Structure 1
């Protein structure tokens, strides 16, 4: 009837439309990320001047409001309208998932836990080998770019097509991009997990696949991954800050991926974000933050938001691996 296990709340009435204008958002206090929000807007200003010009009236009003105190009760003084989203259940519970930029730990030689090679493009002959054959050592060692400490991390990098690598020697972060693919068509690992009853369809995502790997043995991970005979090859690439589809560098917890047809890029959002414990479970608390839609995702549709958590392990922990719920108000100004 009315579950609360994932952060759902029912104190804002029943919604009859996708967005509803409220006199004052049901959120106490001020956003906690004013600095990050400003930094995010500055990135839009410099990286996407066209988008900035079109939304500047909103950003300016929000900035003025924040400097004056940022309390949600004083938003109207600045012409800021708050449109509450009905969410996934028409009770205002907005579906939230998280994503982040992983930093793969790797070494130049195979040592200790680092035993999973990441490859550059081999000759056409070697490209014919399946993932299983490659895992078995079908390719020469001269094509190995690095030895990671996680087979699952390598796969997630395969799907993404690129990834950041830390060799642990204090040198600059390494970036590797898509160079090519092997001669085998890919198969969905997520579909395999869904068919096996291991992961729920609605909770399926790259993060969910990541969590499955963490809760399973090396043999089980390898067995699963081998169900996809495709394999990806990479090449060194000059470092570039993480950007969303909008081409704007993303600021952790100040940006989201959203459905363009519902929440256009550049849209300002005030959100009560559900916090998670060490097991990825809603811990009872929420954080009031401002965020801008600056990315998209293949499975991020409707009123579902994918919060960019940032880069590294901490961002990874905050990302979670299944659906959670918060409240969101789209901020706009009336002419």
Structure 2
């Protein structure tokens, strides 16, 4: 009928088209991240001048509006048009998921909870070993780059093809990028979990898999992870700020991944974002934020948005592990 369990609301009427112009967005107050927004825009300015030139007109109007007070009731003064998105149910409830840059805690020697090795490219003979055999010690220790404290975290890193490591000694954050793969074709761990009815298809994502790994034992996670005989190898790489497909450095909660054919890179968004409690559940509150589409995702389609939460543990907690809903207005300036 009309569920509200995940942030849904139904006080903006029913929509008959993807985007609908509104006199004033149904959102009281002003955006709370004016500073991050400005910073995000500065990154587009320097990192993607082409994209900036094509959108500066909108960015400028928004900035002018923000400096003048930023209240949503005064947007028209600056020629800013608000096109509300119908969302997933045509009631304006836009599907939100989150993602962030994990910082894996690892050490140079296996100690305490640090028992899970991350490897660099071994010789051809070594690459024939399956994930299960490698977990069993098939590979020499000379090929270990570090020992993380999470088996599932390593796997998520394998899927990404790279990741950041903190050795916890005050040295610079370490980055490792894709070096190669082992000789076994990979299998979808997400599929396995859906089959075992452990996770709903609609809520499946890397975050969902990460959550499952935090709510299950090491034995259970290893049993699951071996279902995928494939394995990834890395190599040291110089540090580079996290960027989206658009090649622009991403600012936490001021940028999202979107479907290019629906929300082109550079598009400005005003959004009522749902907040989550410690159990990743909608706590009944929303934050008004400005964000820019600067990334894409294999499973981010339609009017679905993945909010980049940032880097580290706090960003992770805000990410969540299943869908939630808020309202979003595309900001533009009538020519």
Separation in structure 2 between the aligned mates of residue 148 and residue 211 of structure 1, nearest angstrom: 17
Separation in structure 1 between the aligned mates of residue 167 and residue 85 of structure 2, nearest angstrom: 44
Separation in structure 1 between the aligned mates of residue 195 and residue 249 of structure 2, nearest angstrom: 37
**Matched residue SS, 1:75:** helix
Separation in structure 1 between the aligned mates of residue 135 and residue 22 of structure 2, nearest angstrom: 56
Calculate the TM-score normalised by the size of structure 1.
1.00
Deviation at 1:107, TM superposition (A): 0.0
Deviation at 1:326, TM superposition (A): 0.2
Deviation at 1:169, TM superposition (A): 0.2
Deviation at 1:304, TM superposition (A): 0.1
Deviation at 1:311, TM superposition (A): 0.2
Separation in structure 2 between the aligned mates of residue 172 and residue 252 of structure 1, nearest angstrom: 21
| Cα deviation 1:240-299 (Å, max 9, x = unaligned) | 000000000000000000000000000000000000000000000000000000000000
| Cα deviation 1:55-81 (Å, max 9, x = unaligned) | 000000000000000000000000000
| Cα deviation 1:214-261 (Å, max 9, x = unaligned) | 000000000000000000000000000000000000000000000000
Separation in structure 1 between the aligned mates of residue 237 and residue 20 of structure 2, nearest angstrom: 46
What residue number does 1:164 align with? 164
**Matched residue SS, 1:142:** helix
Separation in structure 1 between the aligned mates of residue 182 and residue 38 of structure 2, nearest angstrom: 44
Separation in structure 2 between the aligned mates of residue 257 and residue 264 of structure 1, nearest angstrom: 10
Quote the RMSD (CA, aligned, Å). 0.2
| Cα deviation 1:142-179 (Å, max 9, x = unaligned) | 00000000000000000000000000000000000000
Deviation at 1:327, TM superposition (A): 0.1
Deviation at 1:2, TM superposition (A): 0.1
Deviation at 1:197, TM superposition (A): 0.2
What residue number does 1:86 align with? 86
What residue number does 1:316 align with? 316
Deviation at 1:21, TM superposition (A): 0.1
What residue number does 1:43 align with? 43
Deviation at 1:24, TM superposition (A): 0.0
Separation in structure 2 between the aligned mates of residue 287 and residue 189 of structure 1, nearest angstrom: 34
Deviation at 1:186, TM superposition (A): 0.2
1:55 is aligned to 2:51 = no
Alignment of 1:134-283 (within 5 A): 134-283=134-283
Shift >3 Å, 4+ stretches = none
Separation in structure 2 between the aligned mates of residue 125 and residue 168 of structure 1, nearest angstrom: 33
Separation in structure 2 between the aligned mates of residue 54 and residue 38 of structure 1, nearest angstrom: 17
Uncovered stretches (5+) of structure 2, i.e. residues with no partner:
none
Separation in structure 2 between the aligned mates of residue 4 and residue 237 of structure 1, nearest angstrom: 45
Separation in structure 2 between the aligned mates of residue 273 and residue 313 of structure 1, nearest angstrom: 20
Deviation at 1:133, TM superposition (A): 0.1
**Matched residue SS, 1:284:** strand
Separation in structure 1 between the aligned mates of residue 246 and residue 172 of structure 2, nearest angstrom: 26
Deviation at 1:27, TM superposition (A): 0.1
What residue number does 2:29 align with? 29
**Matched residue SS, 2:207:** helix
Deviation at 1:37, TM superposition (A): 0.1
Calculate the TM-score normalised by the size of structure 2.
1.00
Separation in structure 1 between the aligned mates of residue 11 and residue 61 of structure 2, nearest angstrom: 28
Separation in structure 2 between the aligned mates of residue 284 and residue 209 of structure 1, nearest angstrom: 25
Separation in structure 2 between the aligned mates of residue 214 and residue 320 of structure 1, nearest angstrom: 13
Separation in structure 2 between the aligned mates of residue 273 and residue 190 of structure 1, nearest angstrom: 27
